[PDB]
């Protein structure tokens, strides 16, 4: 009944040629025997290296960010440029970009809309801060983030969308959400999608959890009915990513 799971490696701003070659070999030698979409998101400058070395058939390569259009945007990489180089997945609205790099709900929504129009699969990130959770604002926050994205999408565009719920207080902190905490948010997100977008859209939508996922906590998170896989930061730089993938069996 669950849709196809996703196991996504957000390498963030990390890697050398040598370390990437070693880790890609690890990923290649791990034979995956179930239906799962694996994703690796290296830094922009490492995309060609990963494209040349990654051969595991369960994997696609994703960018960690993009802007919508080419032009006079020194330092940025656009969606047409990624498409031309063969990258058709992108992570958008990651908490680090919302916090450090000026990505408001509306800016994220515009990027997601443009990526969908350009044929990308999009991992769109949402999630509340510790302060918002303590103020009992978790649902209002994640639904505001999601509805801002939804307002710029047609119903058919949702076939390209994957949501990643990452409580900000769980990102890199060693304080993973409990299975109950994660499931509660995934449930309310799917209910909103069901009632506002469509029951069919909601049944097919992948909602991933991220924030301190590791190989030992992944299977119990995946056992929850509304969790469809993981967006993985620190543990995706390590060979234990193999067991995180296999925790989606």
Numbering used by the authors: 2 to 250
Article sentences:
Therefore, mechanism-based inhibitors that mimic the enediolate and enediol intermediates need to be used for structural studies. 2-Phosphoglycolate (PGA) has been considered to be a mimic of the enediolate intermediate and has a K i of 26 µM, having a much higher affinity than DHAP, which has a K m of 300 µM for LmTIM. Elegant studies by the John Richard group on the protonation state of the Glu167 side chain show that the pK changes from ∼4 to ∼10 when forming a complex with PGA, mimicking the protonation event of this glutamate upon substrate binding. The structures show that in the PGA complex the postulated general base Glu167 is protonated, while in the PGH complex it remains deprotonated. Moreover, none of the residues in the active site show any significant geometric changes between the room-temperature and 100 K structures. The atomic resolution structure of LmTIM with PGA shows a hydrogen bond of 2.61 Å between the carboxylate group of the inhibitor and Glu167.
Asn11 and Lys13 provide electrostatic stabilization, and together with His95 form an oxyanion-hole-like environment for the intermediates. Glu167 is thought to act as the catalytic base in the initial, rate-limiting proton-abstraction step to generate an enediolate intermediate, which is further stabilized by other residues in the active site.
